[PDB]
Amino acid sequence: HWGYGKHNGPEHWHKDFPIAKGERQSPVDIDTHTAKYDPSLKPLSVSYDQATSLRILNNGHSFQVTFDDSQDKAVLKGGPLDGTYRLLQFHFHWGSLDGQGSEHTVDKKKYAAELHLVHWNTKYGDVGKAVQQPDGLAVLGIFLKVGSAKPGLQKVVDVLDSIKTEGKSADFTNFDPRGLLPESLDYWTYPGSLTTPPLAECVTWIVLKEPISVSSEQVLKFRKLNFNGEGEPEELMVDNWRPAQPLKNRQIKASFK
Ligand SMILES: COC(=O)[C@@H]1C[C@@H](OS(N)(=O)=O)CN1S(=O)(=O)[C@@H]1O[C@@H](CO)[C@@H](O)[C@@H](O)[C@H]1O
Ligand SMILES: [Zn+2]
Hints:
The protein contains 3 helices and 15 strands. It is mainly beta. The longest helix has 7 residues, at 216-222. The ligand COC(=O)[C@@H]1C[C@@H](OS(N)(=O)=O)CN1S(=O)(=O)[C@@H]1O[C@@H](CO)[C@@H](O)[C@@H](O)[C@H]1O binds next to strand 7, strand 9, helix 1 and strand 10. The active site is at 61 (proton donor/acceptor).
């Protein structure tokens, strides 16, 4: 049903998913001057050395690279988190033009795209259970700006023509997500939600201050993907981002001064 078009997009989502108008929805604008430096925040622990990628998939609203989350291989911990979070998948949100595409914004600034590394809290056993918990998920968000290419992304971009339409998937093993991380792990963090339906309010957001640079040719290949399945009228998978939602009674904390 739901999508990013005029008739089924973000402004329509609340009808099937009333939590869309809830108290901790995502994404949000990160007002850098209002974010509070919290020296009690531990450093982020990103442990991806044993990551096992499995498949890459066009799911009708994004493309995602899925990982084996049946043991504590690639895990996120520390920072604002209590406990261990298993990497399940990563995916992107991007625009039709370089000046839009990100879901979070920084002082109202939009980036060309945003990378989401989705992790779930091992204390809840499976991701289905985790999405029902206020601290079930931790999503690492990384901004993409257009400039120099990101060499680590290229293996991803090169198989996108094999998953053009909704439903298509491919073997995608031995991909190293460390190749997608910026130098600094400085971050903002706040309690939020999934940014697609069901918009469940189960996410601790960890958004990195430092964007990665990707080339125009790389993001252009994102934009050749299709929302539609094969045999349906071609609608380009572009502008698959939800806009900033009301901050309401939340504080964004920064891990850095
Ligand atoms: C493309 O990713 C997904 O389909 C959803 C949305 C995306 O939310 S966001 N954009 O805030 O990172 C995350 N996942 S998800 O909710 O963790 C989605 O959840 C579970 C369903 O309950 C699992 O089947 C996972 O495969 C997971 O992808
Ligand atoms: Zn996302």
